[PDB]
C-alpha cells in the first residue's frame, strides 16, 4: 500500500509556471516606478 | 474446525486498492488550493 | 444394552461443515463494510 | 414343579435389539434440529 | 418371536427427508434478515 | 427375595458414555458460534 | 443425513450485489462533500 | 408412510415474497437518514 | 386354529391415512408461525 | 372402517384464518416501532 | 397461506412521511450555524 | 367451529394507541437533545 | 339391535361451544402480553 | 348436559384486571431508564 | 382491555424538567469559552 | 377467585425508588466528564 | 338416590383459597427479578 | 378438609431473602462497568 | 396508525428562538474585536 | 430470493440533488467575506 | 421520498442580508484610516 | 419544552465588561507609541 | 417519579469555578505577549 | 421485599475519586499545550 | 466483492473543474489591489 | 426450608476481583491513546 | 384403623435435603455465566 | 389365627434398596444436562 | 430412606472445571477485540 | 463423568488464528487514511 | 471457582506494545509538518 | 495472541516517502516569492 | 470495589515527560526564525 | 465532587516564567537594530 | 508504558539543519539589496 501522488507530483510544476507567469507582468509594471521616480527627481535635479 | 476466511482475507484487499485510489483524486484537487493560494499571495506580494 | 449413535456420531460433523461454510459468505459481505465504512471515513477525511 | 421359561427368557432380548435399534434411527433425525438450530442462529449470529 | 419393525425401521427415513427438506426453505428465509440487517446498517453505516 | 438389577446398574453406565460423547461434537459445532460472532464483530470492530 | 443449504449458499451473494450496490450511491453523495468543503475553503483561501 | 408436506414446502414461499417486501419500504425510511445525516453535514461543512 | 385378522391387518392402514392426513394441515398452520416470527423479527432488524 | 375426520379436516382451516388474521395487527403495531425507533435516531442523527 | 401485511405494508409510509417532516424543522435550525458562523467571521475579516 | 377471536382482534387495536401516545412523549424530550446540542454548538461556533 | 347415541352425539356439541367460547376470554388475556411487551421495548426504544 | 362455565366465563376477567394493572408499575419504572438514559446523554452531549 | 399508562403519559414529563434544567448550567459553563475565547484573541488582536 | 397482588402491587414501589436512587450517583459522576471536557478544551481554547 | 356431594362442592373452595394465596407469595419473589433486571440495566444504561 | 401450606407459605420467604440477597453482589460487580466504562471514556475525553 | 409529533414538530421552533437569541449577544461581543482592532491599528496609523 | 431496493436505490438521488442545491446558497454567501476581505484590505491598501 | 428543504432554501438568503448589511457598517469605520491616515501624512507633507 | 437559557443570556454581559475592559489598558499602551515614534520623529526634524 | 439531580445540578458549579478559574493563569501569560509583542516594536519605532 | 442496593450505592463512589483523580494528571499534561504553543508564538512574536 | 467507486472516481473531476474555475475569477479581483497599490504609491513616488 | 447459597455468595467476589483487575490493564493501553493523541497534537502545536 | 405413615412423614424430609443440597453447587456453576459474561463485556466495554 | 408376614415386613425393604440404588445412577446421568446445557450457553455467553 | 447423591454432588464439579476453563480461551480471544479497536482508533488518532 | 472438551478446548485457537488474522488487513487500510490525512495536511500546511 | 484468565492479563500486555510501536512510526511522519511547515514559513520570512 | 502489524508498521514508512516527497514541490513554489518579493523591492530600491 | 488505577496514575506521567521533550527541539528550530527574520531586517535596515 | 487542578494551577506559572525568559533574550536581539540603525544613519548624517 | 519517540527525537534536527541552510542562500541574496541600495545612493551621493 502508499498512495499513488503520481501524477499530483507533477500537478504541482503545472500551478508553478503560472507562479513564475504571473511576476513578469507585475515586475514589469514595477519597472515605471523606477523609470517615472527618476524622472520625477530627473526634472528637479536635471 | 475453524471458519474459512480464505477468500475474504484477499477480499480485503479488493476494497483497499480503491481506498488508495480514491485519494489520489482528492489530493489532486487539493493541490489546487496550493497554487491558488500562493497565487492569492503572488498577486499581492510580487 | 447400549445405543448404538455410531453414524449419528459423524452425523454431527455433516451439519457442522455447513455450520463453517455459511460462516464465509456472510463475512464476505460484513467485508463491504469495513470497505464502505472506510471509503465513507476517506472521502471526508482524505 | 417350576415353569420352564427358559427360551421366553431370552426371548426378551429378541425384542431388545429392536429396542435399541429404533433409537438410532430417530435420534438420527433429532440430530438436524441440532444442525438447523444452529444454522437458525448462525445466519443472524454470524 | 421378536416383532417385525423391517419397514418400520426404513420408514423412519421416509420423515427424516422431510426434515432435512423443510429446513432449507427456512433458512432460505432466514437469509434476507441477514441481507436486511446489513443493508440497514449499511444505508447509515455506507 | 429382591430383584436382581445387577447387570442393570451397570447397564446405566453403558448408555451414560454416550450422554458424555454426543456432547463434544456439539460443543465443537458451538464453538463455531463463538468464532463466526467475533469475526462478525470483528470486521465491524477492527 | 446433512441440510442442503445449496441454493442458500449462493443466496448470501444474491443480497451481497445489492450491499455493494447501494454504496456507490451515498458515496457518490458524499463526494459533494469533498467539493463542497474544498469550495467553502477555497472562497476563503483563493 | 411419511408426511405430506408437499403445499407446505412452497407455503413457506407464500411468507417469504412478504420477508423481501416489507424491507423494501423500511430500507426506503432508513436512505432518509443518509440524507438528512449528510445534509445535517452539509450545513455546517459546505 | 388361528384367529383372521385379514382384514383388520390392512384396516390399520385405513386409519394410517388419516395419521398422514391431518398433519399436514395443522403443519401448514405451524408455517404462519415461521412466516410471522421472521416478520415479528423482520420489522425491528430491517 | 375409517375415522370420518372429513369436516375436521377442514375444519383446520377455520382456525387458520384466525392465525393469518391476528398477525397483521400486532405487526402493524410493530411498525410503530420501526418509525419510532428511526425517529428517536432522526432527531439525534438529522 | 400467506400474511396479510396489505395495510402494515402501506402503513410503512404513515410514519415515513414524519421521517422526511422533521428533518426540515431541524435543518432549518441548523441553518442558524451557517449564517452566525459566517457573522462570527464576517465581523472578524470585514 | 372456530374461535370467536373477534373483540380480540380489534382489542389490539386498544393497546396500539398507547404504542403511537407514548412515543410523542419521548420524541418531544428527544428535542431538547437536538436544541442543546446545537445550542452547545451555537455557543462555540457563534 | 345397536346403541342410541342419538342424543349423545350432539350432545359432543354442547361441550365443543364451552370450548370455542373460554379461549376468547384467555386469548383476550392474552392480549396484553403482545401490548405491555411492545410497551415494555417501546419506553426503551421509542 | 354441558358444563356450566358461566361464573368461570366472567372469573377470567377477574384475574385479567390484575395482568393490565401489574403493567403500569413496570411501565412505571420502565419510564426511569428513558429518563436517566437521555439523562445519561444530556450531560455529555448538552 | 387496554393498559393504564395513565399516570406513566404524564410521568414522561416529571423527568423531561429535568431534561430542560440540567441544560441551562452546562450551557452556562459553555458561555466561559465564549468568553475566555474572545478574550484569548482579544489580549493579542486589541 | 381472582389473585391477590394487593401488597406485590406497592411491592413494585419498592424496587423503583432504588430505580431512581441509583441514578443520582451515576449522573453525579456523568457530570465530571462534562466539567473535565470543557476543562480538556478550555486549556486548548483560552 | 343420587349422590350427596354436597359438602364435598364446598369443599372444592377450600383447597382453592390455598390455590389464591399460594400465589401471591411466588409473584411476590418474582418481582425481584422485574427490579433487579432494571436494575442490572440501569447500572449499564444510566 | 383443606391442605395445610401453613409452614409452606412463610416458607416461600426463605427462598426470597436469598433473591434479595445474590442480586446486591452481582449489582455490586455491575458497578465497576459504570466505572470502568466512563474510565474508558475519562481517558479518551478528559 | 402513524406518530403523532404535532406539538413535537412546533417544538422545534421553541428552542431555535433561542438559537437565533444567544447569537446576537455574542455578536455583540465579536464586535468589540472590530473596534478594538481598528483602534489597535488606528493609534499607529493615525 | 434478494431484497428490492428498486426504488430505494434512485431514491438516493432524491436527496442527492439537495445536497447539491443547498451548497449553492451557502457558497453564495461565502462569496461576500471575498469581496468584503478584499474590500477591508482595499480601504487600506488602496 | 426527498427531504423537503424548501423554505431553508430560502432561509440561508435571510441571513445573507446580514452578511451584506455588517459590511457596510465596518467598511464605513475602514474608512477612517483611509482619511486619518493619509491626513496623518497630510501634515508632515504638505 | 424549550431550553431556560435565561440568565445564561445575560451571562454573556459578564463577560463583554470584561471585553471591553481590557481594552482600555492595551490601547492606553498603545499611545506610547504614537507618542515615542512622533518624539522619535521630532529629534531629528525637529 | 423523577430523578433526582438535587446535588448533581449545583454540583455543575463545583467545576464551572474551575473553568474561571483556569482562565486567570493563561490570560496573565497571555498577556505577556501584549507587552513582548509592543517591545518588539518598541525597539524598532521608538 | 425490596433490593439491599445499599453498599453499592457508596460504592458508586469509590470509582468516582478514580474519576475525578485521573483528570488532573492528564489535564496537568494539557497545560504544556497552553505554555509551548504560546512559547511558539513567542519566539516569533516577541 | 469490491465497491464500484466507479463513477464516483470521475465523479471527483466534475467539482474539481469548479475548483479550478472559482480561482480565476477572485483572482481576477486581487489584480486590482496589485494596480491601485502600485497607483497609491504611483500617485506619492511619480 | 431455603437454599444454601453460602459460599455462592462469597462466591460471586471470586469473579469480582477479576472484574476489577482487567480494566487496569486495558485502562493502561486507554493511556497511550491520550499521550499520543497530544503527541500528535504536539507536533503541530508546539 | 389409619395407616402409619409415621416415619415416612418425617421420612419425605430425608429427600428434602437433598433437594437443598443438589441446588447450591448447580448455583455455583451457574455463577461462572455471571462472571465470564460480565468479563464477556469487561474486555470490549472497558 | 393371622396371617404370618413376617419375613415379608422386612421384604419389602430388599426391594427398596435397589429403589434407591438405580436412581443415583440416572441421576448421576441427569447431571450431564446440567453441565452440557451450561456449557451450551456458556459458549455463547462467555 | 434418602437417596445417594453422594458421587453425583461432587460430580456437579467435574463439570465445573470445564465451566471455568473454557471461558478463559473465549475470553482469551476476546482480548483481541481490545488491542485491535485500540489499534484500530490508534491509527486515526495517533 | 464430566464432558469431554478436549479438542474443543485447543478448537477455541483455530478461531482465534483468523481473529489475528483479518486484523492485520483492516488495520492495513487503516494506515492509508494515517497517510492521505496527513497529505490532505500536507498539501494545505507544507 | 474463579475464571482463570491469567495468561489474558499478561496477553493484553502483548497488544500493548504494538500500541506503544504504532505510534513512533507516525509521530515519525508527523514529523514532517514541523519540518515543512516552518520551512513553508522559513522561505517567506527569512 | 498479539496482532500481527508486522508489515503495516513498515508500510507506514511508504506513505512517509510521499509525504516528505511532495514537499519538496511545493517548497520549490514557494521559493518563486523569495525572489518575486525580493524582485519586487530590487526594482525600488536599487 | 474500585479499580486499580494505580500504575496508570503515574503512567501518565511517562507520556509527560516525552511531551516536555518534544517541545525543546521544535523550540529550538523556531529559534532560527527568530534569528534569520532578524537577519532578513538586519542586511535591509543596518 | 470537583476537578482537582489543585497543582495545575499553579502549573501554568511554570511555563509563564519560561514565557518573560525568552523575551529578554529575543529583546536583547531587537536593540541591535535600533543602534545599528542609528548608526546607519549616523554615518550618512554626523 | 510510555511512547518512543527515540528517533523521532534527533528526527527533529534532520529538519533542522534544513531550516539553517536555507537562510544563508537567502540571506545572501539580500545582501544585493544592501549593496545596490548604497550603490543607488553612492552615484547620486558620491
Redesign the interface.
Known amino acids: 500500500?502508499?498512495?499513488?501522488?503520481?501524477?499530483?507530483?507533477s500537478?504541482?510544476?503545472?500551478?508553478?509556471g503560472?507562479?513564475?507567469a504571473?511576476?513578469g507582468y507585475?515586475?514589469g509594471?514595477?519597472?515605471?516606478?523606477?523609470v517615472?521616480?527618476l524622472?520625477?527627481s530627473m526634472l528637479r535635479k536635471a
Open positions: 500500500g502508499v498512495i499513488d501522488t503520481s501524477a499530483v507530483e500537478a504541482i510544476t503545472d500551478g508553478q503560472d507562479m513564475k504571473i511576476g507585475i515586475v509594471a514595477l519597472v515605471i516606478l523606477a517615472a521616480g524622472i520625477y
